[PDB]
Amino acid sequence: AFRPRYPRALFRWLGEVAPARGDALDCGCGSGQASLGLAEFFERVHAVDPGEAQIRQALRHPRVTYAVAPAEDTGLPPASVDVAIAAQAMHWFDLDRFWAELRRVARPGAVFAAVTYGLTRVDPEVDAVVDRLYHGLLARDWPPERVHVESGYRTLPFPFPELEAPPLEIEERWPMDAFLGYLGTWSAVTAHRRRTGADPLAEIAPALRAAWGTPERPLRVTWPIAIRAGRILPH
Template sequence: MPSDPAATGALDADFPDHFSGHAADYAKARPTYPAELFAHLASIVPACGLAWDVGAGSGQSACALAEHMQRVVATDASAEQLAAARPHPRVTYLEARAEGSPLDDASVDLVTVAQALHWFDIDAFHAEVRRVARPGAILAEWSYDLMTVEPAVDAVVRHLYRAVVGSYWPPERIHVEDGYAKLAFPFERVETSEFAMELEWTLEQLLAYLGTWSSVRRFIDARGEDPVAALRPEFDAAWGLDERRLVCWPLALRVGRV
């Protein structure tokens, strides 16, 4: 039986929602995860039947999972985020909290959480994972912190991150900086390879991504100024004449068997 709070589809507003107000920008500007990650996860699940992508946002992971799984249920507490998600014939998007899904008991082969775990009630979410997981199912949780480009660009990004918008980060951000190391993980660990997102981006793409940071949006709401736009001259000087540069985000990944 699905848990009642999320199965209704009528969610209360008491959750840390930092992205609904710019869901369309988020869907366009956020980086995509490496295809090798999803292929690896599919290789260690008990079956490639049903995957549950939790905190799915606009579907960056869900559509990649659908290349390997027969069906993906992608849930998020933000209807605005889901409305901006890319459709896929094997992905079903549902508005639901991570702590109470609309999924049946013992029905899921793979549970994934991409850059969203720090917003959850961890113990309640892990209890929900146990409920929906088939025997031997896999849970994969990952996050990514600051990207690297090249030293001059990285210095401007760090200045934005710490000195300019540092006080506007939600407190949960510390868990991203820690790579989720201090969050409970009560499952049998499965050793995995290291993965990273690597994309060749223009400066405009990088700035659009920085504009989706929750701290940047909170800064704009509080002060009526765009801190990314204010640093545009510094970014132009650091980026130089190359149209595109390699942008890399190492993933902090933890995988367990339920």
């Protein structure tokens, strides 16, 4: 199964807004899914996640240092970070302890960005089918509400003077089978199977093929990126 990747443009934007390009902190890094992206624009990447299994499987890079730690207690030296990102949903974060930690590690002007993405879009025919899946067939099966990440962090209590983030999107070039594989990663798809014993992707596949046309043809698939960003400490 394949998953959307944050684009180079996101990391490039972080490289420009940061006060310098020395040190990036990846807060809740999982297995390094965004860490290598940061490494393109920042000299050192410090990546933390509390999950030992995630860190054990993390993708090695010469300039990325991983550690098992919560985002709120990184162990990093104070005043050592130019940018910090949380791009895996701020999972299990105590926001107020987290903000204290960012203030401790930040250099003057350092940027924090909470980053997520929204519902995949392809074209209007395919989107109608996806909308029926997401809002219709899976409506009872959405996972427990995570108000902040679901709002694109619009609702996140955010204590830092904010930047205006530019419009950005994830872009992939996927044939139908890759796109179905991706839909199969949604929590709601698993939950639907647990509840009904039926595969909702099998149910929608005829309609999806009709919308797709020739299933082997790769289409441009996008996801809109949502960012809430600001300066942790003043310049």
